[PDB]
């Protein structure tokens, strides 16, 4: 499967004039575009090699569309202050995300369009692309406006149609970097916490895409209780890293197995300690 | 490519 996602952050800055507007675009786990109201360019900018192949018509349209979004979010910050009876002295955050998923055949699976205000759910298009989830009474006001204007029809045309066409275009032109799996290079480290117990840490490095499952077993039952699992983190080269740790009774390091699952792995992997 | 939606909250 594949995805295209755009992430928008609008932040009010009481003393410092115009709000901050950041836009990022991803195909799967690969960033391809950015816009930042505070950068010199005032242009949508490339962040992947493949998108630089697009000509001036593409960049002019995307720059126009992104600056149009920022103007809409400028007014949205003001409206939400009205809805929640907030003054201009506080900094507030609007977040917006939209995109589409496609299967292996590149046919539409589902669409997304959702907003948050100060880190809470505000309004989302439901999975059926026809109706809205309003998180609170402020979002109910938005919902009634959007129902009255038949907003869902035009948004659905993008999510099922245009969004899918852009993703297919990018998947073909960016195929080298987008239609790839980098298998995790796995390894293990050992750290004595005490004289009676040690830490076993199961490493997966240099993998793409980010989706991965690290599992620890002690005699074939998953240690769902006792495993610490760090957040998957970017290496900064277009790959990801992750680790999972268990504290084991020292000299019973043999008795624990780490299982790694990833799209790039023909066979799920399995590690044990080597001293 | 970005959505061209004009709708305000």
């Amino acid at each position, epitope marked *: 499967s594949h995805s295209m996602r755009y992430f928008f952050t609008s932040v009010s800055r009481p003393g410092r004039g115009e709000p901050r507007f950041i836009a990022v675009g991803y195909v799967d786990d690969t960033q391809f575009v950015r816009f930042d109201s505070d950068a010199a360019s005032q242009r949508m900018e490339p962040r992947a090699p493949w998108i630089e192949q697009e000509g001036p018509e593409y960049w*002019d*349209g*995307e*720059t*126009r*569309k992104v*600056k*149009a979004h920022s*103007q*809409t979010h400028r*007014v949205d910050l003001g409206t939400l202050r009205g809805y929640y009876n907030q003054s201009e002295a506080g900094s507030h955050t609007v977040q917006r995300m939209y995109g589409c998923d496609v299967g292996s055949d590149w046919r539409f699976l589902r669409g997304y369009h959702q907003y948050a205000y100060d880190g809470k759910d505000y309004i989302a298009l439901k999975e059926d692309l026809r109706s809205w989830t309003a998180a609170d009474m402020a979002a109910q006001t938005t919902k009634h*406006k959007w129902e*009255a*204007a038949h*907003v869902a*029809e*035009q948004l659905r*045309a*993008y999510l*099922e*149609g*245009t969004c899918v066409e852009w993703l297919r275009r990018y998947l073909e032109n960016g195929k080298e970097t987008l239609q790839r799996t980098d298998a995790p290079k796995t390894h293990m480290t050992h750290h004595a916490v005490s004289d009676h117990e040690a830490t076993l840490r199961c490493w997966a490095l240099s993998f793409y895409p980010a989706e991965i499952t690290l599992t620890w077993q002690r005699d074939g039952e998953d240690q769902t209780q006792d495993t610490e699992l760090v957040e998957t983190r970017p290496a900064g080269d277009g790959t990801f890293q992750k680790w999972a740790a268990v504290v084991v009774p020292s000299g019973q390091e043999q008795r624990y197995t780490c299982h790694v699952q990833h799209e790039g792995l023909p066979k799920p992997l399995t590690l044990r300690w080597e001293p | *490519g*970005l959505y*061209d*939606g*004009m*709708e*305000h909250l």
Partner: T-cell receptor
Amino acid sequence: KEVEQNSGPLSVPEGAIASLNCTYSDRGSQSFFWYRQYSGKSPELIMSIYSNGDKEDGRFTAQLNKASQYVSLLIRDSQPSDSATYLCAVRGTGRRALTFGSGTRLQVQP
Amino acid sequence: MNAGVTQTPKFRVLKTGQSMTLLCAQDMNHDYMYWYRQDPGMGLRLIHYSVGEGTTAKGEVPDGYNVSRLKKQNFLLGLESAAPSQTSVYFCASSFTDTQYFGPGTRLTVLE
């Protein structure tokens, strides 16, 4: 040349189909509208369309062909009261205003 | 919708050099408002538009015209110094998204 319609008049007998045709330059355009304007009155919305294919509303059908950058309004069972100028409107990429064609005069002959 | 957009005046004759303001009003809490002129063979030409209160932008034929949107419900078109070339039918429109609803129009004739 951004939105092109033939001026007409397109002359059609009552009961027959009328196809009002429209082409547009900006391939990224996401919205398409048909307006009716009677002499000395204001444009009235007939149809909006967004996706490739058909959309029906009473005797009206709009059809959008984004590949050929071509959009049509079909008036089925045309009546003399359908006689008017039909205006095609397109919103280009990242635009916050509509671009109107110069319109097609339709006369439905009783 | 069309009925929600009001426009005054309906008709005006002006002497070259005279001033006037056309008033567009909508009670639909529409974010977007538009001033067009319509001339035979030209169709509708955008003069100026507005994406919100306190913001305006040039259309296709802005020169000779100014606008104000100090209040969300009203979009004012000002003719500073009427010229014969401004003899036209003026339509205002409003939209929540891109679907525009038009006012009933203003017929202006400018005479020497």
